[PDB]
Amino acid sequence: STGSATTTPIDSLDDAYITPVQIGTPAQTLNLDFDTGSSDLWVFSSETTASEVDGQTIYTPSKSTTAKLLSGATWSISYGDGSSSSGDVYTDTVSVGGLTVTGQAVESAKKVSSSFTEDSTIDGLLGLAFSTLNTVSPTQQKTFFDNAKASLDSPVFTADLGYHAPGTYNFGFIDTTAYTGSITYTAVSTKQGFWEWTSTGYAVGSGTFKSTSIDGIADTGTTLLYLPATVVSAYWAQVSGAKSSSSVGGYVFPCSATLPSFTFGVGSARIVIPGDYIDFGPISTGSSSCFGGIQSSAGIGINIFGDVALKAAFVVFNGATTPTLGFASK
């Protein structure tokens, strides 16, 4: 089997991407944030505290003839940005782009933190990291990809995120018309539950490439590119007027600037992030200070290849017995 679904930016900055997902019988379609940095499929629901729902589409398990309460199971998750959610668990039929899993754990939110409430465009998350990170207790549950893997033509999914435009998540096949050149594959460590890999270095603009190992995670659920402070300082030093602002919470730059590109290494191959992809716009409405798309990871504990980096590439998440990642230009 295979599946193919279009993923669409939620706003004009590409802050996140939503992909329609069918849950239950008859289908209830919710727009979920596919997140290769987490491993829970959770939804706004008829159980979510009413004051914490503000425009999202909800899953109502009582209207699904295939929903079953997973007795005793609860979940609770906290994300790198400080947001959180928690609730109970149903199993139900879940389809993505024509690919159907029966018995998928659908984690129904009883509580969500303010940032989820305030984002009316995201109806929940669909985790695509390794199932060892799934938070369901007392019986940990499998991701959608883990459940589908054996049925797929090939045990892979691909992320093809657009810049200010729709893109595609495919399951079970690699669309050879979706990228240019060849795909370079690189080793993955699953020890932390992430799609964790080691970039071979970087370049700023037309500068020379610096060979240096940068361990980090391929995370579709993080907006920006978070890298060591040395690397980030070298990038922003090429932008007149750029500075790190403690009050804003990162590097800012004059909105009048033209940003240089940023290149990262994948083995001997190179992925070029155009400068425009690094512009996240005014820090507040009407400001001439703009927020940068490359930021320091020094306070995180891990480097994160988020959407800024991933949307410059066609990315293969290879879930074979020894997982690997593949990157191609496009």
Swiss-Prot record:
Catalytic activity: Hydrolysis of proteins with specificity similar to that of pepsin A, prefers hydrophobic residues at P1 and P1', but does not cleave 14-Ala-|-Leu-15 in the B chain of insulin or Z-Glu-Tyr. Clots milk
Active site (catalytic residues): D35, S199
EC number: 3.4.23.22
GO MF terms held by the record: aspartic-type endopeptidase activity
GO biological process, one term: proteolysis
Superkingdom: Eukaryota
Disulfide cross-links: C255-C290
Entry keyword set: Aspartyl protease, Disulfide bond, Hydrolase, Protease, Signal, Zymogen
Domain spans labelled Peptidase A1: 17-328
Assigned protein family: Belongs to the peptidase A1 family.
Name the UniProt record assigns to this protein: Endothiapepsin
Organism: Cryphonectria parasitica (Chestnut blight fungus)
Organism lineage string: Eukaryota, Fungi, Dikarya, Ascomycota, Pezizomycotina
Encoding gene, per UniProt annotation: EAPA
